[PDB]
Amino acid sequence: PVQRKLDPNTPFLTGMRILDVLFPVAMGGTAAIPGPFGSGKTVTQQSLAKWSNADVVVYVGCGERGNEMTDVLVEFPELTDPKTGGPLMHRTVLIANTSNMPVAAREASIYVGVTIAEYFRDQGFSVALMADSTSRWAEALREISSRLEEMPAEEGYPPYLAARLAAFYERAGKVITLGGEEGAVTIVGAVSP
Amino acid sequence: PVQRKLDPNTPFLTGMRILDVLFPVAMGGTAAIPGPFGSGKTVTQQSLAKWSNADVVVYVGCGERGNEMTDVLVEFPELTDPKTGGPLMHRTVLIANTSNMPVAAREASIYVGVTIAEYFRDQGFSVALMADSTSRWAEALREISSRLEEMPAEEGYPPYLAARLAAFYERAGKVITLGGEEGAVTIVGAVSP
Amino acid sequence: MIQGVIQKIAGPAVIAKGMLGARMYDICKVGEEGLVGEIIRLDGDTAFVQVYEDTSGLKVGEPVVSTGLPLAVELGPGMLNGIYDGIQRPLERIREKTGIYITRGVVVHALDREKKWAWTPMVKPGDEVRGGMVLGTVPEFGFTHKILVPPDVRGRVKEVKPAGEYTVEEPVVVLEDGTELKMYHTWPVRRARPVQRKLDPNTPFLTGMRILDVLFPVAMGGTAAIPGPFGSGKTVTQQSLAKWSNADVVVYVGCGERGNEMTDVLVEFPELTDPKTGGPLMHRTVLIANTSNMPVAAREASIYVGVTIAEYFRDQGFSVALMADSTSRWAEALREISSRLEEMPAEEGYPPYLAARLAAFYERAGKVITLGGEEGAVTIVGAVSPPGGDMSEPVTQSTLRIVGAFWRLDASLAFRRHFPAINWNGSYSLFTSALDPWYRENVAEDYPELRDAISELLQREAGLQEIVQLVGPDALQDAERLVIEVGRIIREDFLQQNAYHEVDAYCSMKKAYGIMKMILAFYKEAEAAIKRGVSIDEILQLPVLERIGRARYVSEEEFPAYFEEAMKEIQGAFKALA
Amino acid sequence: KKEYTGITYISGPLLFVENAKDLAYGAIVDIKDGTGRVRGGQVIEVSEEYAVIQVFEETTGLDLATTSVSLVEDVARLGVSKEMLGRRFNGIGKPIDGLPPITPEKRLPITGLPLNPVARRKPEQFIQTGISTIDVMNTLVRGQKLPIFSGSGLPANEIAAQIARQATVRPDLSGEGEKEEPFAVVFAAMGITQRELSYFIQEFERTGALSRSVLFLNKADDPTIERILTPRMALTVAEYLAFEHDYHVLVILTDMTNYCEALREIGAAREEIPGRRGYPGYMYTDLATIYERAGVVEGKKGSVTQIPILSMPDDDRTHPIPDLTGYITEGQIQLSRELHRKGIYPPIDPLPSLSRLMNNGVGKGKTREDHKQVSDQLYSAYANGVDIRKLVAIIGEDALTENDRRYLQFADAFERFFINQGQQNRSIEESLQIAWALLSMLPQGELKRISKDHIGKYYGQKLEEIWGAP
Amino acid sequence: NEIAAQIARQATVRPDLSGEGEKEEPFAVVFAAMGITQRELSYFIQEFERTGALSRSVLFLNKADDPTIERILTPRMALTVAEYLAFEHDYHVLVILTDMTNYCEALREIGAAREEIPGRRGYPGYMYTDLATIYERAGVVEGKKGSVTQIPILSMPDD
Amino acid sequence: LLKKEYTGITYISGPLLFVENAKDLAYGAIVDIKDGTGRVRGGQVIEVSEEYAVIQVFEETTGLDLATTSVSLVEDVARLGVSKEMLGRRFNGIGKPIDGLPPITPEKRLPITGLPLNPVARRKPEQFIQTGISTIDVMNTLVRGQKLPIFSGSGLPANEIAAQIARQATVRPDLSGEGEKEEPFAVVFAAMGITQRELSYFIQEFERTGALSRSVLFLNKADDPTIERILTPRMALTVAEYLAFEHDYHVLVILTDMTNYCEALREIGAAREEIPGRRGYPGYMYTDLATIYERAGVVEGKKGSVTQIPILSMPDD
Amino acid sequence: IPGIRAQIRFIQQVLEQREREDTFRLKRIKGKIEAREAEEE
Numbered sequence A, B: 001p002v003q004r005k006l007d008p009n010t011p012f013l014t015g016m017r018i019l020d021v022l023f024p025v026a027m028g029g030t031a032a033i034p035g036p037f038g039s040g041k042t043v044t045q046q047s048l049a050k051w052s053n054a055d056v057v058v059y060v061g062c063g064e065r066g067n068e069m070t071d072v073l074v075e076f077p078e079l080t081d082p083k084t085g086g087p088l089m090h091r092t093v094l095i096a097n098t099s100n101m102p103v104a105a106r107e108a109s110i111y112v113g114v115t116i117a118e119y120f121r122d123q124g125f126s127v128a129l130m131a132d133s134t135s136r137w138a139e140a141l142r143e144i145s146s147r148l149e150e151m152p153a154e155e156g157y158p159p160y161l162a163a164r165l166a167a168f169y170e171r172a173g174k175v176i177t178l179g180g181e182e183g184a185v186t187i188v189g190a191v192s193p
Numbered sequence C: 001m002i003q004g005v006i007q008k009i010a011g012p013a014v015i016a017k018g019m020l021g022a023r024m025y026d027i028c029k030v031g032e033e034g035l036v037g038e039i040i041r042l043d044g045d046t047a048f049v050q051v052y053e054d055t056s057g058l059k060v061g062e063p064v065v066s067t068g069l070p071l072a073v074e075l076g077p078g079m080l081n082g083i084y085d086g087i088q089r090p091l092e093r094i095r096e097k098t099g100i101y102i103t104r105g106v107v108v109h110a111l112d113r114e115k116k117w118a119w120t121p122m123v124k125p126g127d128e129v130r131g132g133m134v135l136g137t138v139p140e141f142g143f144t145h146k147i148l149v150p151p152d153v154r155g156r157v158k159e160v161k162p163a164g165e166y167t168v169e170e171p172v173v174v175l176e177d178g179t180e181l182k183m184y185h186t187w188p189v190r191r192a193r194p195v196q197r198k199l200d201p202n203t204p205f206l207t208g209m210r211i212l213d214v215l216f217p218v219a220m221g222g223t224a225a226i227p228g229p230f231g232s233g234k235t236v237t238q239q240s241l242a243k244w245s246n247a248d249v250v251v252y253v254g255c256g257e258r259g260n261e262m263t264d265v266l267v268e269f270p271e272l273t274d275p276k277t278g279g280p281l282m283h284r285t286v287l288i289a290n291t292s293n294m295p296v297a298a299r300e301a302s303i304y305v306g307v308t309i310a311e312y313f314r315d316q317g318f319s320v321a322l323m324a325d326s327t328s329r330w331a332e333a334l335r336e337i338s339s340r341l342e343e344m345p346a347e348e349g350y351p352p353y354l355a356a357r358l359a360a361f362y363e364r365a366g367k368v369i370t371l372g373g374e375e376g377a378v379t380i381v382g383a384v385s386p387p388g389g390d391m392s393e394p395v396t397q398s399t400l401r402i403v404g405a406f407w408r409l410d411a412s413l414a415f416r417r418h419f420p421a422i423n424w425n426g427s428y429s430l431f432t433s434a435l436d437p438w439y440r441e442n443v444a445e446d447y448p449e450l451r452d453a454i455s456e457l458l459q460r461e462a463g464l465q466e467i468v469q470l471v472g473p474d475a476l477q478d479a480e481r482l483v484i485e486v487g488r489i490i491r492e493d494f495l496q497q498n499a500y501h502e503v504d505a506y507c508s509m510k511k512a513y514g515i516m517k518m519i520l521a522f523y524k525e526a527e528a529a530i531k532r533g534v535s536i537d538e539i540l541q542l543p544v545l546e547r548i549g550r551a552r553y554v555s556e557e558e559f560p561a562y563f564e565e566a567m568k569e570i571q572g573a574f575k576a577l578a
Numbered sequence D: 001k002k003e004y005t006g007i008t009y010i011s012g013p014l015l016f017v018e019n020a021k022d023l024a025y026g027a028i029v030d031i032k033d034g035t036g037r038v039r040g041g042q043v044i045e046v047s048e049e050y051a052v053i054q055v056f057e058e059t060t061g062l063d064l065a066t067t068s069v070s071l072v073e074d075v076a077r078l079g080v081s082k083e084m085l086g087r088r089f090n091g092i093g094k095p096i097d098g099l100p101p102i103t104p105e106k107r108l109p110i111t112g113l114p115l116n117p118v119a120r121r122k123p124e125q126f127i128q129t130g131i132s133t134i135d136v137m138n139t140l141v142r143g144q145k146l147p148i149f150s151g152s153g154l155p156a157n158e159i160a161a162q163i164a165r166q167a168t169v170r171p172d173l174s175g176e177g178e179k180e181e182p183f184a185v186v187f188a189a190m191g192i193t194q195r196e197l198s199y200f201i202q203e204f205e206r207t208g209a210l211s212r213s214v215l216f217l218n219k220a221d222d223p224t225i226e227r228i229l230t231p232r233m234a235l236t237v238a239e240y241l242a243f244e245h246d247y248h249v250l251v252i253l254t255d256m257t258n259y260c261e262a263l264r265e266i267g268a269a270r271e272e273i274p275g276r277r278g279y280p281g282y283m284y285t286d287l288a289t290i291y292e293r294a295g296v297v298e299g300k301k302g303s304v305t306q307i308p309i310l311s312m313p314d315d316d317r318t319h320p321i322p323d324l325t326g327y328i329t330e331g332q333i334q335l336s337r338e339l340h341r342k343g344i345y346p347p348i349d350p351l352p353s354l355s356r357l358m359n360n361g362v363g364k365g366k367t368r369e370d371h372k373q374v375s376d377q378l379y380s381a382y383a384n385g386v387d388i389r390k391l392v393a394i395i396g397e398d399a400l401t402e403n404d405r406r407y408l409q410f411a412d413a414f415e416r417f418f419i420n421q422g423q424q425n426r427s428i429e430e431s432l433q434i435a436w437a438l439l440s441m442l443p444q445g446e447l448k449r450i451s452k453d454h455i456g457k458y459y460g461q462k463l464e465e466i467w468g469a470p
Numbered sequence E: 001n002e003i004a005a006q007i008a009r010q011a012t013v014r015p016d017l018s019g020e021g022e023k024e025e026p027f028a029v030v031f032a033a034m035g036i037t038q039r040e041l042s043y044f045i046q047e048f049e050r051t052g053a054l055s056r057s058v059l060f061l062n063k064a065d066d067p068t069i070e071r072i073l074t075p076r077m078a079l080t081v082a083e084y085l086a087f088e089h090d091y092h093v094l095v096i097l098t099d100m101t102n103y104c105e106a107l108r109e110i111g112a113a114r115e116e117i118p119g120r121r122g123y124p125g126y127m128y129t130d131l132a133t134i135y136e137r138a139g140v141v142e143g144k145k146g147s148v149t150q151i152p153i154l155s156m157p158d159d
Numbered sequence F: 001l002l003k004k005e006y007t008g009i010t011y012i013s014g015p016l017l018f019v020e021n022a023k024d025l026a027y028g029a030i031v032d033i034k035d036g037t038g039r040v041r042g043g044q045v046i047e048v049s050e051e052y053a054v055i056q057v058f059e060e061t062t063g064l065d066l067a068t069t070s071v072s073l074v075e076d077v078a079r080l081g082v083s084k085e086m087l088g089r090r091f092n093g094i095g096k097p098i099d100g101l102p103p104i105t106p107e108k109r110l111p112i113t114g115l116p117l118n119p120v121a122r123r124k125p126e127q128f129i130q131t132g133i134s135t136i137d138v139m140n141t142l143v144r145g146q147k148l149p150i151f152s153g154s155g156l157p158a159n160e161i162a163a164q165i166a167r168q169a170t171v172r173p174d175l176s177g178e179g180e181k182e183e184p185f186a187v188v189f190a191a192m193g194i195t196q197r198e199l200s201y202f203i204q205e206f207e208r209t210g211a212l213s214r215s216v217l218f219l220n221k222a223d224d225p226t227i228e229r230i231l232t233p234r235m236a237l238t239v240a241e242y243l244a245f246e247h248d249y250h251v252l253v254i255l256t257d258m259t260n261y262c263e264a265l266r267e268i269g270a271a272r273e274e275i276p277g278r279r280g281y282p283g284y285m286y287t288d289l290a291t292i293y294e295r296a297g298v299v300e301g302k303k304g305s306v307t308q309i310p311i312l313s314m315p316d317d
Numbered sequence G: 001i002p003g004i005r006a007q008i009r010f011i012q013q014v015l016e017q018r019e020r021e022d023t024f025r026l027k028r029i030k031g032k033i034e035a036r037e038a039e040e041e
């Protein structure tokens, strides 16, 4: 819970030049990155995780490859965030559910990630959550829906897919917490059509 | 029942130039006007109800708006029937099963109009039957066949749909009645794809 | 064997109760008339029989007896000069019984039980026979039919009947474990006949026409695909490569097509001539015949019957050309089969296992050493014909994935009167790199180099065809007009071939090599004549080109008396110029 | 007649019957209501528990208390005879002309036994239809099936009735074949309306072409299962006449699209999963079942020629009905909407039409020695006249060559003297006379596809002298 | 949403050009919202409080994280209040029905939970009847001063 | 051990057969199905319950019945017997040897599904294996411990590129810090559905230049049943992970036609009555391709690599 | 030419997708029709 949801009025400085000048997301904003394979979409997510103004970064990656997870684990403790000094890994909570790992757990990975981002939001920080391949979460919901013998709608996905997806993207926001202090959580969701 | 069915050799004068010159309709003939939403179906059928040389006109609103039946109720007594001097509302029967009325009555609404037109055919008149939205009768049959838990044909419709359509459109056609004198029903049907 | 009764009749699906112990995909006789149907979906005590014919007239309570054995073929002597159908029911004896129609429940046997054959054994009592071992001979049509032990039977032999005039039901040898062995055996048409070693393709299937063995070989034990459009000369090409073939047993499979499109096979094919003895071609040809109104299961099983008969003839040690016409017809019969079984379709309407069935058809075709110890081959030249005329259906794509050559007939060339109508810009053959040492030994050591040279000239003519189409051949430079004229002489002499001619119907490798070297020598000597500066006009009107024109209308008895003199005339008439 | 009372489940068209094991599969039943009205039905899904019956008509007065089913004719037959050559029937076979019922010489099952492919000849002799652009450019031969690929608004019933009242075998063109073979037309009209039914009975009683023709006409308010059974009745009367009395039979099947829609709705009523684009999976075999009941037979003298007519649903040849029909039949002749709006009858463009079995049934002894070459030359000349007509819109009349203006005038004269026939009846001699009068416009030497003997015999003829089309 | 709020803040009847005298009767506003996230809701309530309309409006709000089945009852109870205020107290109610595509996917959810045969693209066969029973509850009646005008908003999926 | 043959089949429809009161079978167990003649088939236990368990039969169910058919239990987890002498031999799609030689005396029997690697134990691929192809050397670069597909077509030579970079690819340590004796190299080559022409072509290309003494072959013809085409990449990657993470090889794996693997997966996946995805391919095909692509890579602590080249033809380009 | 061919191939593939969804729903409803009798027992 919160006390009050505010309006976003301060940009989320992604450190790029096309994603903050021409098409900016604010601090309590929600953004979505589509794109086919070989079109970036991983270096942009890692650039959001490296060069941002956010205090903490929750990097939840569900359904994608593990070389990216070990890349983030290898090359973050050598870098330095340009806010307080010290290692870059001392502000990242990273949740990995690789594609060879079980498929009903990447539903839970997204909720675990956004609950951790809301926990660091409820203290006064400005969390950035990078939710990577939410389409693989839609495929996990398709898997359990077809295992449960439900009617599909539009290529196998369950009819409550848009409701679950809206209830995930609705948790991002610029609020004042119950402690009086203000906080924010932004969500960048990479979708892989 | 009927004594004989003549072959048609006399046009149903609509009044519109294209529909009477290039694509005519005989007095014992059927006709079908499909088109998307906003194309000109209901204005055309009210034009046929307003200007054609039918002795009586049966207007069957089968699952359409209430404002476009209120128009026919309000502004027809202000007009004058051709071939006589009495007002235009004095020659029309108006069956009106609108959109928010119960859906199971649309089959009954599309049959009550054709049997009233057959009754005025059996008196020696020349009846026009403007039935709009036979596709709404088809959709009503689909909604009631869902409750019958049957197996449908293409698009969801029950498989007896074209038998119903053939039995509906076959009830027209320039007859010599049981009383010896001749009459006709001509059916103009709007289809909404 | 196992006799139940009908309890439910829905369409061609007869649910028969009582049959506990019946086998799956097992033939059975449903009804008092006898209706052949295969058993699917055993459920408890019952069995769902898919019946081949129409069930209109069957009541409930009628007996269903079980055969015990799957859809099989009766392999033995008495098949050549034979017109069968998709489940091997001889159509001529049905014509002899029941008139011009095929009444449902005509039971005729696949082989003639009344014809007396001339047995001659090659075993003796005390011998130890394992499977595939030839145990006798029977002369069929000037054709030593070698009777095999069935390929999963072994033991010690006794009671060998002496050399006499027997019939196909009489057992000829008896093992010492019971187990008599007749002249025939039933083999299931869907499991492959066992062999001991598949060889590799390094020996060419000599087609007979000098494009499909020079430019696009097929390598005996191989696999080709030809598309059939209308007006392409399809039937004359199939008849020519079955008449003039390298093979010595031909198996034709018409797998369900138009009635008028194969009743002119069944009247034009038994009047051909075997050009090695003089008799008709049907004395070494088996012909499976389906029109499009036969039952679906026969029209789907016809190619498996064809491949199993052709593997029976390779097991004796022979060369079999199987030509399965119109595999797309088969594929939609399989699609209809899968539609009554309530399956989720694939890419167009097809089953998910269309390419698995096509792989099981085409990959049962290779050069092999049999269980007896001698080589044999089932080279398949099976055709295809999509209904749209475009090559992007699932059937043609799966076929192009699993074949080794493709020979694009186009109807434009037969409209242009270029027979055979093989488009070379769209055909391909992958057996060129593997047939190299056979060419190097048995033809000449330089044969692939001038094969690539003629392919290079036919590449460059169609490469600069656009300038000829935009302008006309009289305004090309010098050498480009030489390219179009030598490509023209390649087309109008070498590639084109009259199948109805006396001696142009067949062209061996030596004759093709001769015309090949003659054309290429004329090209790369007239090129040097242009390098002198001689005008193009005196090269074209020149009397030695008549020799290259009638290079192909020459018997191969007299081609080593013609090739040398023409090759001397080319050098003479190109050293006489300035 | 041992009627089965005690039923359950009337629903839709279907009704279940308890304790019916003696009903054979495919049998026909009479369903008597408590009022006394008798309906007809067909038994499907017979079992020990209950037998399903699909009712022909509607199920209105039926109830579970007063209803009885009785067996009639345990497989569907018709009584066939020679005395039915002037009669009209409705789908099942009841006479609708008011004349008394026929006395059946035989009682034949209506479903087809397939011909034995050993026992078929090659279809080698021709049949004229009177229509010049069917007789000349793509000939129908005796033993051929070929459809007319009509369109939506196009006049297919008119060409159906014209070919019906105009077809004739001419044995004079052989070496004096006798006229002891008679000709007969079987005409199955399915899915038709009242208007076009009145049109066919007017058209067949007008010219007197009803004495050699037998009609199987059912309307659209008739049951759809009668639309299934109608081509079976037509083809078994055809096979009876042609293989028992040596007739030359022409089977005209009007609106094969309506048959396919009836088949789809009966499959979905009998509760099975459709296949490709909603049409049933067994459609190829069930459609080759009534396409492949045509052709000559060895040892018999009679023949069954067949013209199915079908409308493409939105004028495309990739729909399953014309796709499978052209995948069974021998070519097609295709009506063009463009020539009909231009105003031309019969509106047949010969550029997408094809007779796959034409070249067998023409030549010397069949029609004339120049028939194939005239057909090929007219096809090439019209095919390169149309694109010159399209080209002159952007270049200009004077800026073409001589030969291009000659082909343009050829195309202009062709599609209003050769195709635009009207209802004139042309034999093959008048049709080839008009064809050589059209080829006389192009100069000699441009007629490349004709032998010089036929050019020397026939080139040079006025159009305003022959009066075949003045 | 900006176009709907602009229409809601500047729609006025013209009494002088019509010829019915003059009173300048303003609009009551019924605002039904089904899955507005937080940004659309913030824009609408700031626009309404900036133009001074929340003393004339009644809002039936349904946020994006609220449960997705009460979207079935949201438009019906908005238009119940609209029909009441127009036809028994003679107001001039303007009804803004935000984002009907969320209502249609809510009824697709409850119609695919019940295994019902769909129409096109998975939406059930009675969606025409549900959208009709919502929409057709508007207009004017005879002899009474009221009116229900409707502006729904639709998000066309692939536009 | 002890053999426990279940009798009492109740339903056999497609590849599916229902064994009743088979409570003692686990999910995903491997069974063999003895016919009433003596011909044993294989199958896998799906959908275990208290009243029936659904065996999916691997091969075709031709000849089975309800009286004489037995279902035994063979090795609950699908293991493979792997030893180190496999280098230089040819195998079936399952793993049985087809070269005229006696089988493998196994050193270790490890499962073929393979456990997922832990992303804190994986390290970065940071070195260089050199193929002979100049583009794949200079412009693109096959890093030691990654996977990269070769997208090809129909009339495009992809088998020849496979047989080329299978025989002339090597790692070269002399440009790095040396240890040249320390690191050996090996090739695992799995062909999934090939013509006999392609079979003889790869066997000639591997016995032509002495390239077979480094490599292991898991060839699969199109005559073979579809379950061998499903099981081929898992056998090849089991042998690859053994040789890379037990003896410090630098295994290069070539999966030469994944399109036939996907078509075999679509064929065997239309038996669970599950709605397919895009064009008939199943909804779980991302997870099934990922469970055989993610098994590449390098692990910290070790020195071995698994480097995958999936070659696959676009069905249309 | 290839732009129109790509649009045609895209539309044909998505129409085949909708047809395959419809024939999945019909198989599901036929199983649910059959379950009525097995519950009737």
Ligand SMILES: Nc1ncnc2c1ncn2[C@@H]1O[C@H](COP(=O)(O)OP(=O)(O)O)[C@@H](O)[C@H]1O
Pocket (backbone or CB within 6 Å): B036, B037, B038, B039, B040, B041, B042, B043, B044
């Ligand atoms: N024949 C016509 N003449 C003049 N205006 C027309 C005509 N047809 C349509 N319109 C205009 O377009 C609107 C179309 O309404 P309508 O035809 O009822 O749509 P639909 O046919 O989809 O129900 C009409 O309200 C009118 O404003």
Ligand SMILES: [Mg+2]
Pocket (backbone or CB within 6 Å): B041, B042, B064, B065, B132
């Ligand atoms: Mg309307």
